[PDB]
């Protein structure tokens with residue numbers, strides 16, 4: 001399983017919706033609540049240059065926010081990013 005992390009705040013509808021989407025995918029993931037934690041939020045802001053929640057990561061790859069991960073899903077490429085099963089056809 002990949003290391004999936006989402007940074008959230010408890011008043012934010014968009015972080016709640018992103019968590020919901022991730023739950024809907026059947027993956028395990030770590031939620032880091034930064035509602036009350038300036039240091040943790042600043043550390044992540046330094047990493048991405050983004051100053052909002054949610055921020056979603058898969059093994060150090062930053063996928064963005066609520067809008068971004070929903071766009072990835074419409075594009076059909078969120079599953080792959082999250083570590084869901086890949087199928088390959090082998091031909092001789």
Ligand SMILES: N[C@@H](CCC(=O)N[C@@H](CS)C(=O)NCC(=O)O)C(=O)O
Pocket residue numbers: 009011012013014015051052053054064065066067068
């Ligand atoms: N369109 C963004 C919206 C993100 C956003 O506006 N987050 C707000 C809270 S609801 C925020 O991080 N405000 C700064 C803060 O709450 O500290 C997304 O898709 O993630």
